[PDB]
Amino acid sequence: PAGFAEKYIIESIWNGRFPPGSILPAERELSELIGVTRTTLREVLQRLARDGWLTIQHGKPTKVNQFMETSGLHILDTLMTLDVDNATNIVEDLLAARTNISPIFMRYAFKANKENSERTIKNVIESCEALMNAASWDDFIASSPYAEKVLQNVKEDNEKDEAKRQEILIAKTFNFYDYMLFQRLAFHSGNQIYGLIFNGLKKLYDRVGSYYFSNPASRELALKFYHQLLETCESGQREQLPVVIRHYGMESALIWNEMKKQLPTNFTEDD
Amino acid sequence: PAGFAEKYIIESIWNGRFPPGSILPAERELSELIGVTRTTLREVLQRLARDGWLTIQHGKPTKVNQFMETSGLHILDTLMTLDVDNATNIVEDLLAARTNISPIFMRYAFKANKENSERTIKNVIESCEALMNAASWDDFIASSPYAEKVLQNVKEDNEKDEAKRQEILIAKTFNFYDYMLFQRLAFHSGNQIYGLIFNGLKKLYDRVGSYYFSNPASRELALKFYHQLLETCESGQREQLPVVIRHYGMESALIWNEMKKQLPTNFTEDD
């Protein structure tokens, strides 16, 4: 469908066919270039510029935008699918950014939204511990109030190898609750921009977590981290919050630094 | 054009016509509801869900997404155009977030990209001082290497009142360089996520600055701030960076807190 057009124009800016300083060709020459309907080319080439790839103003032609000068956070996940060997750098940026800003929005959340923060952390802890103790993923999800949302986000029930299907589904479900924790606390901070940051980063977040949380050590470390966050909020021990986060940022990074050596085949996937 | 459709569906989620928990009606019933072509309804109602307003999966219907659960930073500027009396809260979120994360990405930029940071700040300072000393805005822009980009971003040469045209253009140009400073330093941090944060916030940023920087005190305060940032980077006095930023975050906020009382008519505008 239109995905052929969008992914073609996007990929042809990454392989030097239409560099970020070049002009994009005519309307009809592009609609003719790889065989796309006129009006669909109009209405997805327009929205390929709303993502920050292009700049189209009336009269003057359409011009390819510079690298990362206009695009938002979404671009990162797109850049994961192109050129495998910069994905690691993107993941370092994600982990480092989350570790950097978590003490701010979490101290705000613990101060102004103590009870809501505690309820969120308790829900995440209970769901993660129920999933880790379940006999299978189908058993946890059959009895989970988050079943439908998880199924929206954990769309993988297609693998024919049932054991690896189990591992992948456990990882994606745990990542569902990890994201829920960070994003919801970000909104609990009282500043919507932090939550919106995670919202913009969600696709990259889930791609990273679907592999990262396939390691049992990652899940146990995250679980200890959640319990520590809950204890910090409940006790009002403010000075403990940056230390906890700091430690968790380090150790998790180390785990990633090892798992990075064996990235799965699918990890850099065009959707 | 399609803007009628997109702004109608978006506005009808804000005035309780299709609440964030309701279902959206049929394809043909909506394409018939306010008179939009079938396929254009398909291809902008689809992309009104890529902005996070809807969720459309095959077989199951399209469902209105919850308030701010999926949408990215862009949503903020959209929310400025709806319901005037929450715009102030959005601006508080923006100023507070920038003040919060600026010490992090600026200390990173000063440490790992000292020379690039200094070049960026010097360019911003020189452009701002040249604009503030110019006999008119047309004189500054006629002799500015940033002329075309500014004209892309400072599209206002339509006002018939020339004096107020001058004030508005000076404000928008100064905001052009203020944004350039914060965003470019954010990218200089070495973590692309900070720069991408500003990129996602750019529309709200420019809307806010086009009024905020119409006050001469705002421009002078920002200029002193830029000089202080340059001195901090050049001297390697790390401990001064959070203090400087902190002070600037306070005073600017105070200025906004006063100017907030007389928001211009256009401030909450549907494009």
Ligand code: NI
């Ligand atoms: Ni707030």
Ligand code: NI
């Ligand atoms: Ni980096």
